[PDB]
Nucleic acid binder design. Structure first.
Ligand SMILES: [Zn+2]
Ligand SMILES: [Zn+2]
Length: 704
DNA sequence: AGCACGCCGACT
DNA sequence: GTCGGCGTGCTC
């Protein structure tokens, strides 16, 4: 008989072999019910052949075959298989992550009638306090008066079906089945909204994409906000939609502004399906089949929407391609942008990466000749060198602050991220604590009695006096969630303070990250970036870029939305070249410079990076386990000169809570060479018996 | 991951 | 004398 290698939803980097009951034909990509020691669990058959590696007598059989045809097209299958090894995640978790939950649970991949609880119209007219002390029946009807509740979703909510049942008894609610709907849109597909009123460059862009709309093509569409990136998306979609092919457009988690959705639903008289994290499992399933069956012209979604099955997909476009939201950071740590062009190239399709602030790596491939580029077309910097600081603010700015709160306006003050790792700086002369081993910046660690370089793990006592000018007023950098509110309120009394990370009125809102493109602040007239020092002297080589991204966003947003609001910058080094080139020459010029020196130090995107992080409860066991794997990695047959593994080094968040976090960084000029290096070294991880008593994670191409 | 087996505190 | 803590280990 034949050997069924089936992948299982367990964190084990390998398939499991079983036998077919002869007469059973399951191609790879089908779900099979299969015994797994003590449980009965589902698996995708990764491959069926006629040669195993263990006694065929021991090998249990497969219980049942749940799919006649694979639930993956060959393109998305190949794509998942490649990503499983490039990212080094257990193939079973990768394959399952890519399916609707109901398909991970072995239910049939066909349409099923959806049952919903709805409020009767007495249920929407009877006074809600009429049953005020009826426990949850009340809050159940509350939720009902905002929309239909699915039966199986009730379990996730605070109330139970008992309440809904008691309501149905009292005539307030009722259950029913929303029968599906068939739609043939390809016949009689027009466009509402308007006819296009494009200008010259948008026209040229649509032409360039159209003249290649069939072969693989990667287009970076670069244009600042309001230059009509979306427009040329909808013209591109139109052309692709005329053929009868389908379109997939991806946005950030917080990029689903009903503004953007309502615009798409108007332009086409074809079905659009939009996937936001708030849909239940039945809505996610049916959308999966509607897309695959062709009954859906357009799918709009986020990171996960990349794995959507398409009868005939014609184009895929991702907005705000620079957004970090496209890199999952729990579990399987894939990057939807990179996997997107892979799915685009393997489908022979145009991919459109639209951005107002393009990622440095995509700019790097544009230059390298792998994407083509399609283009569309006050302030004050305040030197803090010596000025007395009032809770971290500069006098020349606090006075320019009150003048803005004077007219009952609002103000955003932007700091570095929560948990930023701080440098050391001389308040008077600008000298920064550098490492005596590499020309890297030292990370200060006040409670630990020492400095510590994150690139070479050196240590030095905290120097009490500046070794270039001699001021005793040596300060850290970055303020973040240190409750600037506490030091701030005494100076701005009766003025409230809040945060904008997840009406009118004069106030100060601190910020730690970039704003959402569909998230404006109407009452804000003043924005100041206090994060320039932390950005420019960080242990994170990407801090500058993220800053320069935030700067060009808040400079164009507040600067020319229609009011003349001001941006102020607070650096101990206004003379800095990268800082100035950004300020007076724009993001693209800064980018070209930042790219050109990422190369001199040999970091992404010129090199490839891989972070292995492990944490423990004693600070002694995780590091040395990494030190062993470090030594084993270097002993790989494919190691040569270019591979470097710095570490082990404590993570930039040393002890989040009680556990202690250490990490090891691998880098190499060749992405797949390094993929082969760790891929081989990973099959022999059982050599180190401690790899199963630390919590270890593997992060390919990290964002940090 | 599940779900074992496997040796030491508070309870009938 | 129990019923139960989760510390290592396996699952074709
Ligand atoms: Zn100094
Ligand atoms: Zn160093």
């Amino acid at each position: 008989m034949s050997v069924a290698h089936v992948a299982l939803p367990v964190p084990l980097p390998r398939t499991f072999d079983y036998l077919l009951p002869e007469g059973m034909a399951v191609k790879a990509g089908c779900r099979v019910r299969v015994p797994f020691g003590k449980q009965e669990r589902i698996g995708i058959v990764a491959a069926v052949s006629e040669r195993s590696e263990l006694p065929l007598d021991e090998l249990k059989p497969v219980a049942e075959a749940l799919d006649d045809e694979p639930v993956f097209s060959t393109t998305v299958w190949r794509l998942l298989m490649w990503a499983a090894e490039y990212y080094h995640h257990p193939i079973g978790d990768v394959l399952f992550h890519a399916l609707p939950v109901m398909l991970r649970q072995g239910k049939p991949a066909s349409a099923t009638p959806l049952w919903y609880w709805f409020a009767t119209e007495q249920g929407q007219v009877v006074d809600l306090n009429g049953l005020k002390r009826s426990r949850k029946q009340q809050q159940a009807l509350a939720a009902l008066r905002q929309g239909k509740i699915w039966r199986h979703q009730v379990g996730e909510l605070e109330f139970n079906e008992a309440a809904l049942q008691a309501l149905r008894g009292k005539g307030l609610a009722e259950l029913a089945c929303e029968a599906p709907a068939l739609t043939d849109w390809r016949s009689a597909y027009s466009v509402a909204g308007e006819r296009l009123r494009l200008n010259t460059e948008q026209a040229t862009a649509v032409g360039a994409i159209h003249s290649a709309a069939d072969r693989f093509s990667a287009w970076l569409l670069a244009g600042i906000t309001g230059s009509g990136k979306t427009e040329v998306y909808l013209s591109v979609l139109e052309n692709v939609l005329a053929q009868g092919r389908q379109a997939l457009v991806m946005v950030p988690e917080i990029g689903l502004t009903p503004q953007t959705i309502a615009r798409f639903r108007q332009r086409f008289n074809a079905p659009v399906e939009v996937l936001h994290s708030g849909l239940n499992d039945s809505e996610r399933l049916s959308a999966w089949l509607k897309a695959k069956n062709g009954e859906a012209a357009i799918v709009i979604g986020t990171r996960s929407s990349l794995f959507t099955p398409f009868k005939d997909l014609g184009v895929i476009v991702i907005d705000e391609e620079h957004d970090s939201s496209y890199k999952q950071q729990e579990g399987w740590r894939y990057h939807a942008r990179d996997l997107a062009v892979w799915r685009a190239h393997s489908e022979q399709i145009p991919i459109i990466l639209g951005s107002a602030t393009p990622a440095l790596e995509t700019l790097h491939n544009v230059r390298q000749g792998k994407y083509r580029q399609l283009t569309l077309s006050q302030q004050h910097v305040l030197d803090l060198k010596g000025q007395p600081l009032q809770a971290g603010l500069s006098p020349a700015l606090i006075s320019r602050m009150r003048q803005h709160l004077q007219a009952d306006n609002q103000v955003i003050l932007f700091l570095n991220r929560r948990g930023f790792a701080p440098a050391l700086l001389c308040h008077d002369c600008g000298w920064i604590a550098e490492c005596p081993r590499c020309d890297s910046y030292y990370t200060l660690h006040q409670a630990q009695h020492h400095l510590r370089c994150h690139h070479c793990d050196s240590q030095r006592p905290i120097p009490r006096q500046c070794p270039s000018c001699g001021s005793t007023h040596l300060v850290p950098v970055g303020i973040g969630t240190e409750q600037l509110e506490q030091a701030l309120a005494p100076l701005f009394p009766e003025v409230p303070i809040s945060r904008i990370d997840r009406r009118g009125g004069a106030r100060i809102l601190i910020g730690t990250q970039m704003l959402a493109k569909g998230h404006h602040f109407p009452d804000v007239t003043l924005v100041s970036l206090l994060d320039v020092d932390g950005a420019l002297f960080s242990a994170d080589f990407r801090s500058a870029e993220r800053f320069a991204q935030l700067y060009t966003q808040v400079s164009g947003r507040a600067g020319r939305a229609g009011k003349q609001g001001e941006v102020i910058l607070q650096t101990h080094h206004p003379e800095h070249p990268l800082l100035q080139t950004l300020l007076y020459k724009g993001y693209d010029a800064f980018a070209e410079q930042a790219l050109a020196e990422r190369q001199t130090m040999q970091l992404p995107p010129w090199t490839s990076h891989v972070l292995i992080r492990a944490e423990d409860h004693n600070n002694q066991q995780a590091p040395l386990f990494l030190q062993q794997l470090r030594n084993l990695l270097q002993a790989s047959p494919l190691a040569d000169e270019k591979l470097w593994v710095l570490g082990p080094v404590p993570a930039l968040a040393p002890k989040r809570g009680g556990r202690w976090r250490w990490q090891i960084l691998l880098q190499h000029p060749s992405r797949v060479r390094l993929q082969h290096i760790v891929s081989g070294t990973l099959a022999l991880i059982n050599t180190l018996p401690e790899a199963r008593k630390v919590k270890w994670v593997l992060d390919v191409d990290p964002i940090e």
